[PDB]
Amino acid sequence: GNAKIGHPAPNFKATAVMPDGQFKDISLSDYKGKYVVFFFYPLDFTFVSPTEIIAFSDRAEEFKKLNCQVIGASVDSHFSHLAWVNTPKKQGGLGPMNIPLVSDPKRTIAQDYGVLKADEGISFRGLFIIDDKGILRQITVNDLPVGRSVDETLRLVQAFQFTDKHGEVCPA
Amino acid sequence: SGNAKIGHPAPNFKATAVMPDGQFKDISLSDYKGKYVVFFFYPLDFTFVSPTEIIAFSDRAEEFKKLNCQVIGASVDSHFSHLAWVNTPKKQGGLGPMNIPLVSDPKRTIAQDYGVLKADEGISFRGLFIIDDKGILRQITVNDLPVGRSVDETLRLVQAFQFTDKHGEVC
Ligand SMILES: *C1=C2C(=CC(=O)C(O)=C2C)[C@]2(C)CC[C@@]3(C)[C@@H]4C[C@](C)(C(=O)O)CC[C@]4(C)CC[C@]3(C)C2=C1
Ligand SMILES: *C1=C2C(=CC(=O)C(O)=C2C)[C@]2(C)CC[C@@]3(C)[C@@H]4C[C@](C)(C(=O)O)CC[C@]4(C)CC[C@]3(C)C2=C1
């Protein structure tokens, strides 16, 4: 792929299901000026991914206080994403979302980020931290069965922002 | 770039390491088949953020041993540089005695194989890799230089891969 630490994160333009439940075409570059956590999950209607997606959505306000946009993505269609959102939470659905979910049906976004599992056409569990100038700061890739931690992601986002700011702090 | 791919054999290496007993030894990743491995890079010796990470992994090595997991650190510095840093007491800014081996990658080929060499600076990013007991790469972590890693998160990951190893085995 083309995701390199210290280089601009690969842009994308893709259809996402938005928190209001409608579809919108969004780009990574829409979020310049804010940190971005961009994470891939393999497929909709699976059993590890919902724990992660719901945790990032549930805790979205902790990312907003860090001026950080969270974006999820999978190769499944945006229609499939919405179907999972609309499945009742008590029956296994995602329920209402506080984060957008991108659809990568051509697999080009997962390829650009180096996380496509080529022999199956789905993404590994890749997570990327992109700073407010668009520069990639952190790469995380898990094999399919093992989920990610919102606590760890918050730790990293905050730590990068602190080290970003150290040199402009008042010298008193 | 690099040859580290999830679900494929982790790139092998053979390199001089400073072992916990203070001796040099040429070791290979394949020496540790039968154990999980946490293999982590740091940019260079005698720095500020890196010793806190290295000491944290060394101090907590028993928690990895209980998971049948070997921890190995690495940088492009010479094996003499590693040994001098170990022989510098922690209270004077050194590493002090270590419970983990520290690999020397002076030709930068290990960092290149793992995709973590920072071009034109000749140092590695803060890369960390989790390799299972069959030598297969399960997890990739790469931090830009300013931000360190968490032993807690690394243990959570090792535990989680070992958990999922307990179902779905075909052979
Ligand atoms: C941080 C602060 C400063 C004052 C201050 O009241 C304050 O609240 C904060 C947080 C000082 C000490 C004030 C003076 C400057 C800003 C100077 C002066 C300079 C001409 C300016 O006014 O912008 C240029 C910047 C410079 C040299 C650095 C910061 C600070 C020393 C300063 C930072
Ligand atoms: C599991 C598998 C094996 C191959 C394989 O392609 C595969 O998909 C799975 C799930 C191997 C590596 C194949 C060879 C055997 C089956 C051997 C050979 C043996 C003669 C047989 O054919 O059954 C006897 C069993 C033996 C020695 C152990 C398993 C495996 C090494 C194997 C398991």
Residue numbers in the entry:
A (entry chain B): 4 to 175
B (entry chain A): 3 to 173
Task: Pull verbatim passages from the article behind this deposition.
Peroxiredoxins scavenge ROS via their peroxidase activity, reducing hydrogen peroxide and a wide range of organic hydroperoxides. PRDX1 is a crucial antioxidant protein to regulate oxidative stress. Then peroxiredoxin 1 (PRDX1) was identified as the ROS-manipulating target protein of Celastrol in colorectal cancer. To obtain homogeneous oligomeric and less flexible proteins for crystallization, the Cys-52 and Cys-83 residues were mutated to serine, and the C-tail of PRDX1 (176-199 aa) was truncated.
To reveal the stereospecific conjugation and binding mode of Celastrol, the crystal structure of PRDX1 in complex with Celastrol was solved to the resolution of 1.76 Å. Then it was found that two PRDX1C52SC83S,1-175aa monomers formed a head-to-tail homodimer, and two Celastrol molecules were covalently linked to the Cys-173 residues of the homodimer. Moreover, the 2Fo-Fc electron density map contoured to 1.0σ for Celastrol linked to the Cys-173 residues confirms that Celastrol is a covalent inhibitor of PRDX1. For each PRDX1C52SC83S,1-175aa homodimer, the covalently linked two Celastrol molecules stretched into and formed non-covalent interactions with adjacent homodimers. Interestingly, the binding modes of two Celastrol molecules with adjacent PRDX1 homodimers are different. For one Celastrol molecule, direct and water-bridged hydrogen bonds were observed with the Trp-87, Asn-89, Gln-94 residues of adjacent PRDX1 homodimer. While for another Celastrol molecule, direct and water-bridged hydrogen bonds were observed with the Arg-140, Thr-166, His-169 residues of another adjacent PRDX1 homodimer. For one Celastrol molecule, hydrophobic contacts were formed with the Phe-48 and Val-172 residues, while for another Celastrol molecule, less hydrophobic contacts were observed. The covalent binding residue (Cys-173) and non-covalent binding residues are from different PRDX1 homodimers. It is known that PRDX1 homodimers form into decamers in its catalytic cycle, then this unique binding mode of Celastrol with PRDX1 homodimers is likely to disrupt the decamer formation of PRDX1 homodimers.
